[PDB]
Amino acid sequence: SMDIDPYKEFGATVELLSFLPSDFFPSVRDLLDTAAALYRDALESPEHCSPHHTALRQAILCWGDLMTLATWVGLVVSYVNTNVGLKFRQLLWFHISCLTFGRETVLEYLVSFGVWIRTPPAARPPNAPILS
Amino acid sequence: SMDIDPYKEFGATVELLSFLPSDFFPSVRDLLDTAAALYRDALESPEHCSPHHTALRQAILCWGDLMTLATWVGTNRDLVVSYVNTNVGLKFRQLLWFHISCLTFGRETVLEYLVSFGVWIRTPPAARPPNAPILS
Numbered sequence A: 001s002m003d004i005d006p007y008k009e010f011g012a013t014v015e016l017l018s019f020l021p022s023d024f025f026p027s028v029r030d031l032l033d034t035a036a037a038l039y040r041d042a043l044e045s046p047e048h049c050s051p052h053h054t055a056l057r058q059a060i061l062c063w064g065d066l067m068t069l070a071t072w073v074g075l076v077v078s079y080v081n082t083n084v085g086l087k088f089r090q091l092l093w094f095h096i097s098c099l100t101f102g103r104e105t106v107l108e109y110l111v112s113f114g115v116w117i118r119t120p121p122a123a124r125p126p127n128a129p130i131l132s
Numbered sequence B: 001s002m003d004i005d006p007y008k009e010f011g012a013t014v015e016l017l018s019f020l021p022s023d024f025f026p027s028v029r030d031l032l033d034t035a036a037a038l039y040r041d042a043l044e045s046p047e048h049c050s051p052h053h054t055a056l057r058q059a060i061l062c063w064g065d066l067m068t069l070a071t072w073v074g075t076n077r078d079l080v081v082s083y084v085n086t087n088v089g090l091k092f093r094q095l096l097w098f099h100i101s102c103l104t105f106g107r108e109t110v111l112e113y114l115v116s117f118g119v120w121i122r123t124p125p126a127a128r129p130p131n132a133p134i135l136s
């Protein structure tokens, strides 16, 4: 079979996004609403716009199919939100953040927050790293 | 909410691909095997290559997640298995075929062929030409 990495063409890796803890990412619901709020006209556009746009379109739609399936099945519903949910919380956040703040900024922040959150509370700085 | 069209940025529509009958498209298995055979290095490449490549990568992976899910659902029934392959299956058979064919024969060619075969298969057997339209 093949082994394809969705973040590879965007300069990152699966393991790199797994560096960030599970509770770091917003809910799938909050992510879909943000994609729409900031890029509704662009995501529905006839233009490619950018590779980030192309991937995000598939991501939103793919999660749609996944929800349509689990809704039809009705732990099973909980399965999508627990295991599959985490995967899209990463993917959706990655592209939205890259479109909003820029690829390079997102990547630096990723390693910066991973090191920061892993530092015990007593020693780590009060202000977490930010995008800009 | 949003209404996003996966084929829209590629100059087609969901409705346009639904023009071709369900038995027109190869199986998902034959489609995934074809994707690897022709574009294994490109699909795994660090370079975008093309918007079709970017979309095709997500499609393969998305189908993967659906299969990983259905594989786990099954282990925890046969009626459910028919759902993934009957309803969701058709959707990806179109999507996978669309991108694979566009990369192989060229976007513009695929679209002309798409409409040509739709008209051809819909003509009753007695009247329609013996030779169906082809690509390139």
Ligand SMILES: O=C(Nc1ccc(F)c(Cl)c1)N1CCc2n[nH]c(-c3ccccc3)c2C1
Pocket (backbone or CB within 6 Å): A026, A030, A031, A034, A035, A092, A093, A096, A097, A129, A130, A131, A132
């Ligand atoms: O990861 C995120 N948020 C986030 C990203 C993508 C999303 F799709 C969603 Cl729903 C949320 N941040 C962590 C670091 C950071 N630094 N600066 C800002 C910021 C906050 C408000 C306005 C402007 C910037 C943030 C928020």
Ligand SMILES: O=C(Nc1ccc(F)c(Cl)c1)N1CCc2n[nH]c(-c3ccccc3)c2C1
Pocket (backbone or CB within 6 Å): B026, B030, B031, B034, B035, B096, B097, B100, B101, B133, B134, B135
């Ligand atoms: O839709 C398809 N086939 C197809 C496409 C994408 C796929 F991902 C898979 Cl698995 C199959 N055809 C219908 C019209 C046509 N015209 N010409 C050719 C052809 C055949 C062999 C060698 C060279 C050309 C074909 C085959």
